[PDB]
Amino acid sequence: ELVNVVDEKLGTAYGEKIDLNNTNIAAFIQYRGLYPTLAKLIVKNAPYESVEDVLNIPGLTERQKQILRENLEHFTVTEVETALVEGGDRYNNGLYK
Amino acid sequence: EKLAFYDYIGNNPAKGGLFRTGPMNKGDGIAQAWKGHAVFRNKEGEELFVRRMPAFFESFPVILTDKNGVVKADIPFRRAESKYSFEQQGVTVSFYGGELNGQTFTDPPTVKSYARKAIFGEIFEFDTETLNSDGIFRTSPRGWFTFAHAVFA
Amino acid sequence: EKLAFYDYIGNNPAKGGLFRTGPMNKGDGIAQAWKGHAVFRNKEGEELFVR
Amino acid sequence: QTANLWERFCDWITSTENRLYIGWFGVIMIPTLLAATICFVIAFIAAPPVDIDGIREPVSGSLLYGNNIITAAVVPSSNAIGLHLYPIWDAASLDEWLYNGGPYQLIIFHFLIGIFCYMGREWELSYRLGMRPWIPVAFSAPVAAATAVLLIYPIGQGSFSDGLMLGISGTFNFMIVFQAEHNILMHPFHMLGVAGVFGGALFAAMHGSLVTSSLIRETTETESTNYGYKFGQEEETYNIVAAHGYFGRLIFQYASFNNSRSLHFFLAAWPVVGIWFAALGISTMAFNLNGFNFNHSVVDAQGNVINTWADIINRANIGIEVMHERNAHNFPLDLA
Amino acid sequence: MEVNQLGLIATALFVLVPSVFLIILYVQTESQQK
Amino acid sequence: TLTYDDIVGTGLANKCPTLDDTARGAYPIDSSQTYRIARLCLQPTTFLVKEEPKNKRQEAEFVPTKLVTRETTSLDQIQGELKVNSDGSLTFVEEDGIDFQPVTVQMAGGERIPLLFTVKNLVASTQPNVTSITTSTDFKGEFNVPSYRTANFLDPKGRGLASGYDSAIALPQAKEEELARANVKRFSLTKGQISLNVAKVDGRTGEIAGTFESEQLSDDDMGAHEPHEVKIQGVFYASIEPA
Amino acid sequence: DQKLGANVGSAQGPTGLGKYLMRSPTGEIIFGGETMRFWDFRGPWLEPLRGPNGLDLNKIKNDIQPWQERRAAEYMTHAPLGSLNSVGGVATEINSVNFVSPRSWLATSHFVLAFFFLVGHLWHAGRARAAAAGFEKGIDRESEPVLSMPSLD
Amino acid sequence: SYDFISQEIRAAEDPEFETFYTKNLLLNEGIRAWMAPQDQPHENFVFPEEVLPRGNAL
Amino acid sequence: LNPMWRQGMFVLPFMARLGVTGSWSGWSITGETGIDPGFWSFEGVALAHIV
Amino acid sequence: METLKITVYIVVTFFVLLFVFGFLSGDPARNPKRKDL
Amino acid sequence: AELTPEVLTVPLNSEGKTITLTEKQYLEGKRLFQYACASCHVGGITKTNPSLDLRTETLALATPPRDNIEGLVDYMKNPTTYDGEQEIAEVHPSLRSADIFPKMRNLTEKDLVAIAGHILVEPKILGDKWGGGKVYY
Amino acid sequence: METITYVFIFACIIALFFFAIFFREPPRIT
Numbered sequence A: 001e002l003v004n005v006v007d008e009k010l011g012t013a014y015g016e017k018i019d020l021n022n023t024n025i026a027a028f029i030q031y032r033g034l035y036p037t038l039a040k041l042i043v044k045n046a047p048y049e050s051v052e053d054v055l056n057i058p059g060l061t062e063r064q065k066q067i068l069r070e071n072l073e074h075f076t077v078t079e080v081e082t083a084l085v086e087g088g089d090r091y092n093n094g095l096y097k
Numbered sequence B: 001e002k003l004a005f006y007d008y009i010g011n012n013p014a015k016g017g018l019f020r021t022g023p024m025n026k027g028d029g030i031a032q033a034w035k036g037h038a039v040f041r042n043k044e045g046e047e048l049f050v051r052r053m054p055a056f057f058e059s060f061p062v063i064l065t066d067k068n069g070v071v072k073a074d075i076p077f078r079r080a081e082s083k084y085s086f087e088q089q090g091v092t093v094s095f096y097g098g099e100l101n102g103q104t105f106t107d108p109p110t111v112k113s114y115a116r117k118a119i120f121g122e123i124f125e126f127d128t129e130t131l132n133s134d135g136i137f138r139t140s141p142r143g144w145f146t147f148a149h150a151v152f153a
Numbered sequence C: 001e002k003l004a005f006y007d008y009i010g011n012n013p014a015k016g017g018l019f020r021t022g023p024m025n026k027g028d029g030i031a032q033a034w035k036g037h038a039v040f041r042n043k044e045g046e047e048l049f050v051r
Numbered sequence D: 001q002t003a004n005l006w007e008r009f010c011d012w013i014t015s016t017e018n019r020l021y022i023g024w025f026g027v028i029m030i031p032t033l034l035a036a037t038i039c040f041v042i043a044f045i046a047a048p049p050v051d052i053d054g055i056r057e058p059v060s061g062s063l064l065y066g067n068n069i070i071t072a073a074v075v076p077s078s079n080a081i082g083l084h085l086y087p088i089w090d091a092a093s094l095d096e097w098l099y100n101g102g103p104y105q106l107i108i109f110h111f112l113i114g115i116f117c118y119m120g121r122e123w124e125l126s127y128r129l130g131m132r133p134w135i136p137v138a139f140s141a142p143v144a145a146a147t148a149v150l151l152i153y154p155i156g157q158g159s160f161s162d163g164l165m166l167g168i169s170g171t172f173n174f175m176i177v178f179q180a181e182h183n184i185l186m187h188p189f190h191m192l193g194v195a196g197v198f199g200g201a202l203f204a205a206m207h208g209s210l211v212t213s214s215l216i217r218e219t220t221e222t223e224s225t226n227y228g229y230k231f232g233q234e235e236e237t238y239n240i241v242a243a244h245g246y247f248g249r250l251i252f253q254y255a256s257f258n259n260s261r262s263l264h265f266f267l268a269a270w271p272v273v274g275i276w277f278a279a280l281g282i283s284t285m286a287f288n289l290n291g292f293n294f295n296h297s298v299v300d301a302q303g304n305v306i307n308t309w310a311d312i313i314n315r316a317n318i319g320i321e322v323m324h325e326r327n328a329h330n331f332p333l334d335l336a
Numbered sequence E: 001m002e003v004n005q006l007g008l009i010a011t012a013l014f015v016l017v018p019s020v021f022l023i024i025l026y027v028q029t030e031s032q033q034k
Numbered sequence F: 001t002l003t004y005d006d007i008v009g010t011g012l013a014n015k016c017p018t019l020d021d022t023a024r025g026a027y028p029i030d031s032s033q034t035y036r037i038a039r040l041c042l043q044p045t046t047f048l049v050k051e052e053p054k055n056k057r058q059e060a061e062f063v064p065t066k067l068v069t070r071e072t073t074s075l076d077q078i079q080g081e082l083k084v085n086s087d088g089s090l091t092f093v094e095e096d097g098i099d100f101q102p103v104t105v106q107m108a109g110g111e112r113i114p115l116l117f118t119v120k121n122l123v124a125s126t127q128p129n130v131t132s133i134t135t136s137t138d139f140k141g142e143f144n145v146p147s148y149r150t151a152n153f154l155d156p157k158g159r160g161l162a163s164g165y166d167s168a169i170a171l172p173q174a175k176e177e178e179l180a181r182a183n184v185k186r187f188s189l190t191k192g193q194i195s196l197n198v199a200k201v202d203g204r205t206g207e208i209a210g211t212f213e214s215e216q217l218s219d220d221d222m223g224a225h226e227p228h229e230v231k232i233q234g235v236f237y238a239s240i241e242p243a
Numbered sequence G: 001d002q003k004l005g006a007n008v009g010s011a012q013g014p015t016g017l018g019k020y021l022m023r024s025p026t027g028e029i030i031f032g033g034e035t036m037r038f039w040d041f042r043g044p045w046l047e048p049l050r051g052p053n054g055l056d057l058n059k060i061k062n063d064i065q066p067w068q069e070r071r072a073a074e075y076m077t078h079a080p081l082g083s084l085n086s087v088g089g090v091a092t093e094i095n096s097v098n099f100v101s102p103r104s105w106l107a108t109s110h111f112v113l114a115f116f117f118l119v120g121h122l123w124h125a126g127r128a129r130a131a132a133a134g135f136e137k138g139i140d141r142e143s144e145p146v147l148s149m150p151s152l153d
Numbered sequence H: 001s002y003d004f005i006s007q008e009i010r011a012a013e014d015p016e017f018e019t020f021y022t023k024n025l026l027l028n029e030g031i032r033a034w035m036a037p038q039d040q041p042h043e044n045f046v047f048p049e050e051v052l053p054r055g056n057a058l
Numbered sequence I: 001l002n003p004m005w006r007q008g009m010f011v012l013p014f015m016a017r018l019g020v021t022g023s024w025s026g027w028s029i030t031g032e033t034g035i036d037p038g039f040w041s042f043e044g045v046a047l048a049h050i051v
Numbered sequence J: 001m002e003t004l005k006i007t008v009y010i011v012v013t014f015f016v017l018l019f020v021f022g023f024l025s026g027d028p029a030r031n032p033k034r035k036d037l
Numbered sequence K: 001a002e003l004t005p006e007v008l009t010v011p012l013n014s015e016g017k018t019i020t021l022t023e024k025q026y027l028e029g030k031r032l033f034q035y036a037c038a039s040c041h042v043g044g045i046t047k048t049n050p051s052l053d054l055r056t057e058t059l060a061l062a063t064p065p066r067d068n069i070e071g072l073v074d075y076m077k078n079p080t081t082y083d084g085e086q087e088i089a090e091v092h093p094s095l096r097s098a099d100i101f102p103k104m105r106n107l108t109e110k111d112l113v114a115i116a117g118h119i120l121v122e123p124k125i126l127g128d129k130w131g132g133g134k135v136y137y
Numbered sequence L: 001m002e003t004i005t006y007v008f009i010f011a012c013i014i015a016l017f018f019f020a021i022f023f024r025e026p027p028r029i030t
């Protein structure tokens, strides 16, 4: 049958946390120290098999790795959804204020 | 059943259109049976109430509040910043009385479908085939009488 | 398919009605495809022909 | 002789005996209005959908493509064209020209030339007839208004895709978007426009009723009173002193016209000036000098906004703004 | 388009009945002695 | 060299660079060096759409179409890694660029076929043992064809995937199952195939040009109808650089 | 968005056209969105990014200077939109910014003036013709031209 | 005179069908959703941001 | 399988009989695509009769 | 398209020339009163 | 409702020290904010980057914290990205870049304190309408 | 059938224009 895949995602951890594989980059403003520098690196280096794989992004500084560890509790990963990552939508999803 | 049917906006005479002609049955259909009273709950088990459509509105959003009027769920338009979706809030619907008495639905599209009917009040099953009904509300003879006699006056 | 379609009585102009109005497609339908040639046989295997 | 044959032509062109006056303005008016009318009729009936907003989202305007009289329109040329002139011969094919809204440009440019020449033609025949010359000054008011919505507003906004759409529902779309983007209801020139058309209708009914009220008895009880006037009779057909005696008592004496020339000048001037201002409203909101903005103008002692009816208007304007051309904006401000 | 099936007869009679009324009155005026 | 004001409005901006008839050389490949395509340009000259016949037994044909969206069709400023593989073949891995164009073409009779002409995420490889790129070199590869509209796009009744209504709000009490395909938007992701036939090589400058043929599906209107098969033919230009 | 990591050349917008960059009808690379209509614009802060094919993606990726970012932000936020009481911004803007562009003041005033001067031309041109011919005060009752013309029918 | 039923049947089934009539209904839906909470205060409307109909960006 | 005579066409065969076989929209009654009929397409014939 | 363009240019030029030479042909004298204009 | 000293009392630093603004201070801050900032920050939003607003809760999660007078005054001298990693005076008005943002050229320490106090007081009056955008108009 | 109806009414109106202008009751001075 036909299903809206975005509504379906809202029932996964994507609807509860920042999904490192799908969520638009503005969501990283919700927590201290993640935007824009780490947020860019995270979206650029996605997808991730598990949240803690975010710690392995090449070139991270030692403080950045600590900042990421403080925020892993706010991250999740789900399977990449084409509708959320095409169109450059992770960088600008057409929503402002 | 007759009491539940009065508590349904498809019988409200201020829901019609000047050129939507004929019987009310031509719009929502020939009513067959009450489905029963839908009780919506979130995943914590709190009962939620669908905000009903006022007669002024041809269309209306789907918003669910607790008994104190605090918004607890809705059907979002933009999804990217949704906080209250039925999927996030685990909204379910259970029916008491009527055809669906004793049944509970958890599939979000199905729960949302019933929530869309609940903005109209009590939920009915309709025969939409016999008259090839188009799903658009019409007024009753109360409405047509009033119109003709105010205009003629 | 065009040759088989001519060998079909729904295209015969002497099969109509004075008040059966409109295109031929309104009667038997809009032709889509030839089903193929039907060969009928009995249990002995003799080929039989529909009158 | 060339000079004689040419003078015979000039005499026929300017002849006061043609059933419809031609004239030199008519030499331009007739071909341009015919081209615009023929293209409009064909397009209104049969044109395929047009990508008005340049986002490959074609809007169906014609009857044959699923419209009725109320919803059909000839759709403006594409936003991708902007203000570029898009004649048929610049298209790779008629198919391309139709997709991109070519018919709209052909129609509106021939129409505008045609109505400007119609206006000059009103001057011209009045000159041939020995009349006074200012009937085209009255007609300049509707001409100015048509020019505002078909030419000036798209120039100011940079695209014929924002000009008046040539249909009944298309007109309402233009009006509603305009209200969100300029708050035209709060612009004093539109207010003057409304006074012009409300007042013009009022004064038409007033003048019509006062003359009708004082017709001199010239007919029997059977026949229409219209037979009491004969075309070209020398005497006036109503008692203007009776009419003035009624109206001066209805309000007060000095509020009423007893001079028929003053009265009829006023009847001309009120709607004409009102529509001049209406047209100037559109033509200056074309450059985004917009209606009054009293959004959050009233503030309490602490600094809370106390809403006024202006703020309720603003909420409706926002609802229009966020919904219109729902796939066309990628960035947060609608700057044209 | 799925239009109302009575729209055609409604429009036809809306045009025809009053137009015919006027044509009747006009022609019988013309035929009166002048 | 032409400037913008030499070019503007002529249609030349939608045309890929060309090479002279003298460009029949060979660009040497050093298997120890890394390479990139600094610029890849793809200029369609023909759009063909495969007919969808009723019999479904006869072989459907690709037929000509009429472009209605003007000189807006070319892909350009595309770049990516040009890998040298163990067998001497080359593999181009597309990474960035103006690598899509919406295009609408019209069939005989008027049916409009929108498509997302694209080589997004192209990976295309030559034959083995390309010690030099020559006019005998060919590239063959596959690319992604995402939905022609992206997830925010709203239909004329305001329905969409990542935004919009989820029902036909103008028919409030209609039965919904019959409208499911129009109400529930779906985001297509399919594969396309492309071949690049190198016809010219400037061995000195690292520039190549030739013809291409690509095959891909057209717009399915976010799941509302079946897409059509499209064949795109045109010319290409590419500039190769050590990296 | 490019600073955040977007590949602005390959970013497909909701319609299928580029969200940031697209082609004009003759192929030049231009800014996307509704500003596709304004691709004839030229200004000194933008031309360094333009090449023979239009906007140059390499220059966009590598060569935008801070003074260009400054100028674009300044000009975006001083767009010539504003109310008659000089509230800057779109018509839905709240009060705060006291701004109407000089370009809007000068364009509107001179359209108003040019329009009435065309009306004055018509007025005085028609009157000058009628006065030169000797009927600017009205029709001579004893010599009315139309009375000497054949009827039209 | 709110709707044309034939237009709504076609548009509901055909997401490529668009007229100025359907365009104006979208504007109406915007007016209703964005003006009703302040214009009808006795209703105590609370429309969370996510349910408000709106196009891209704006 | 759906020629003009299955579709109730009455004047179309008379245009075709004398050589008008293509539409301005690009099709021909023998099933061709991308043909240019010139002015004397079915539509041009109709227009000429109206004028 | 090129033939259409030339045709329209000629047509436009023709009517515009009629207008200009027409109004140059002693138009002030084409009135019912003083014709010595 | 009234603009009281309590409403005008705002955090001076992250350590919990407060300052009570005068009514004259707040009004000066409002005027200077219109003069130098409202073209982009009208109503508490940010027109050229809507992802970052002027809500107190947003300022509290910036690095270094910007939800206090000293944080906001420091920002107006030497602005950074939201994570503090990058100095952005070349594209954001500040005392450090008053050469290219001339409306900053005459601002005193007192002026910056006033602007900072306006930014902290305004959500105490307007609530979620500050930084809310058109949804809250 | 609805397009035919709309175009038919329009065509009748244009015909009426023609008769109203060229076959009017001639205005006559008496």
Ligand code: CLA
Pocket: B018, B019, B020, B021, B022, B023, B140, B141, B144, B145, B146, B148, B149
């Ligand atoms: C007091 C008058 C009146 C009222 C209130 C009703 C009420 C009703 N009728 Mg009944 N009916 C009536 C008189 C009335 N009828 C008359 C006189 C007849 C004989 C024709 C009928 C024959 C009839 C039938 C056959 C049917 C009904 C049906 C119905 C029901 C559906 C109504 C509907 O769709 O209308 C629709 C209303 C409109 C579309 C409005 C029309 C507006 C007009 C066209 C405006 C005209 C404007 C004018 C031209 C302007 C002039 C301008 C000029 C001055 C310048 C409703 C209970 C239906 C039903 O369900 O039966 C079981 C049904 O099938 N009625």
Ligand code: CLA
Pocket: C018, C019, C020, C021, C022, C023, I007, I008, I009, I010
């Ligand atoms: C020689 C004339 C002629 C012929 C052979 C055709 C043939 C055709 N027409 Mg065309 N048509 C014609 C003229 C003709 N038409 C005219 C003049 C018009 C304008 C009205 C049309 C408008 C038209 C339309 C709109 C359509 C057709 C269609 C068709 C096709 C189906 C025909 C059908 O169903 O008929 C049915 C015929 C009858 C039911 C017979 C009627 C007999 C009358 C009523 C008897 C009257 C008796 C009289 C009152 C008694 C008097 C007694 C007194 C003397 C005492 C067929 C190919 C259809 C088609 O398929 O198009 C693609 C279609 O939709 N035609």
Ligand code: CLA
Pocket: D027, D028, D029, D031, D032, D035, D085, D086, D087, D088, D089, D105, D106, D107, D109, D110, D113, J008, J009, J010, J011, J012, J013, J015, J016, J017, J019
């Ligand atoms: C009065 C006659 C007249 C006029 C003024 C126009 C005007 C126009 N036509 Mg139309 N046309 C006409 C009759 C006319 N048409 C007729 C009879 C037909 C059927 C054959 C057409 C068929 C037609 C088509 C199919 C198209 C046009 C188009 C156009 C537009 C572009 C024309 C152009 O590029 O000229 C070329 C420019 C010149 C030839 C230079 C001008 C020559 C004069 C001598 C110079 C002076 C001009 C200057 C403004 C001074 C004016 C002086 C003033 C006192 C009169 C323009 C609005 C196109 C369109 O609408 O695009 C959207 C288009 O596609 N026309």
Ligand code: CLA
Pocket: D273, G084, G086, G102, G105, G106, G109, G110, G112, G116
């Ligand atoms: C070309 C004419 C023109 C233009 C474009 C401007 C533009 C400007 N003026 Mg200047 N000014 C002008 C002439 C002009 N002015 C004249 C003639 C005077 C002497 C009165 C002034 C004296 C003046 C002062 C003292 C000030 C300005 C200011 C300004 C700025 C704010 C404008 C404002 O708020 O208007 C408000 C808009 C109105 C009052 C609307 C007037 C609408 C009129 C009445 C419509 C008239 C229509 C037409 C002319 C009459 C037709 C009648 C019909 C029957 C024929 C703006 C840049 C202000 C500024 O910011 O300076 C730094 C300021 O303080 N102007």
Ligand code: HEC
Pocket: G073, G074, G077, K033, K036, K037, K038, K039, K040, K041, K046, K048, K049, K052, K053, K054, K055, K058, K059, K062, K066, K072, K075, K076, K080, K081, K082, K088, K092, K093, K115
């Ligand atoms: C546009 C040209 C602006 C003007 C004028 C002012 N600001 Fe701004 N501001 C602007 C942007 C694009 C940003 C985000 C920058 C980034 O990349 O991080 C900001 C940010 C701020 C902040 C931080 C907000 C936060 O949530 O952390 C503050 C406190 C701020 N701006 C204040 C401010 C003041 C006081 C201004 C006038 C003196 C001012 N800004 C002007 C854009 C623009």
Ligand SMILES: CCCCCCCCCCCCO[C@@H]1O[C@H](CO)[C@@H](O[C@H]2O[C@H](CO)[C@@H](O)[C@H](O)[C@H]2O)[C@H](O)[C@H]1O
Pocket: D003, D004, D006, D007, J021, J024, J025, J026
């Ligand atoms: C900015 C571009 C400038 C380009 C150069 C413009 C040059 C203009 C030259 C104007 C030449 C005028 O040419 C003019 O034409 C017509 C031709 O019958 C004449 O007009 C004549 O018409 C009829 C006779 O047929 C007489 O009733 C009328 O009184 C008489 O004037 C003028 O007497 C002649 O002088």
Ligand SMILES: CCCCCCCS[C@@H]1O[C@H](CO)[C@@H](O)[C@H](O)[C@H]1O
Pocket: A082, A085, A086, A087, F094, F095, F096, F097, F099, F120, F121, F144, G007, G010
């Ligand atoms: C299998 C496809 C899954 C969906 C992937 C969507 C984003 S793929 C996208 O492709 C672009 C080049 O076209 C690059 O610019 C960008 O870095 C990359 O993320």
Ligand SMILES: CCCCCCCS[C@@H]1O[C@H](CO)[C@@H](O)[C@H](O)[C@H]1O
Pocket: B029, B110, B113, B114, B117, B123, B124, B125, B126, B127, B128, F172, F173, F174, F175, F176, F177
């Ligand atoms: C996908 C369908 C979910 C099943 C229950 C839907 C809500 S109830 C449903 O509502 C319809 C009108 O919308 C009526 O026609 C129908 O009789 C009724 O069963």
Ligand SMILES: CCCCCCCS[C@@H]1O[C@H](CO)[C@@H](O)[C@H](O)[C@H]1O
Pocket: D042, D046, F109, F110, F111, I023, I024, I025, I043, I046, I047
């Ligand atoms: C005399 C007026 C002629 C009007 C010509 C209309 C365009 S021609 C028209 O175009 C349609 C869509 O492309 C085709 O389906 C149809 O077969 C064709 O006749």
Ligand SMILES: CCCCCCCS[C@@H]1O[C@H](CO)[C@@H](O)[C@H](O)[C@H]1O
Pocket: I037, I038, I039, I040
């Ligand atoms: C009334 C509109 C006239 C439009 C004229 C278009 C001419 S089109 C012209 O017509 C010829 C007809 O035989 C063709 O042979 C020729 O190839 C074609 O280009």
Ligand SMILES: CCCCCCCS[C@@H]1O[C@H](CO)[C@@H](O)[C@H](O)[C@H]1O
Pocket: D038, D093, D094, D095, I024, I025, I036, I037, I038, I039, I040
């Ligand atoms: C009353 C004005 C209507 C004019 C219509 C003229 C169509 S003209 C027609 O156009 C076709 C476009 O593909 C060409 O195939 C053909 O060669 C050309 O003659």
Ligand SMILES: CCCCCCCS[C@@H]1O[C@H](CO)[C@@H](O)[C@H](O)[C@H]1O
Pocket: K012, K013, K014, K015, K064, K065, K066, K067, K068, K070, K071, K072, K074
């Ligand atoms: C030197 C002792 C450390 C504490 C006093 C100096 C830092 S104080 C500090 O000032 C910052 C802006 O500069 C703000 O981010 C912060 O909220 C404020 O508390």
Ligand code: OEX
Pocket: D053, D079, D157, D161, D162, D177, D181, D324, D325, D328, D334, D335, D336, G034
């Ligand atoms: O196009 Mn028609 O509308 Ca004048 O704003 Mn911008 O652009 Mn579109 O949006 Mn809003």
Ligand SMILES: [Cl-]
Pocket: D173, D177, D323, D324, D325, D326, H023
């Ligand atoms: Cl719109």
Ligand SMILES: [Cl-]
Pocket: D328, D329, D330, D331, G032, G033, G034, G035
């Ligand atoms: Cl935009």
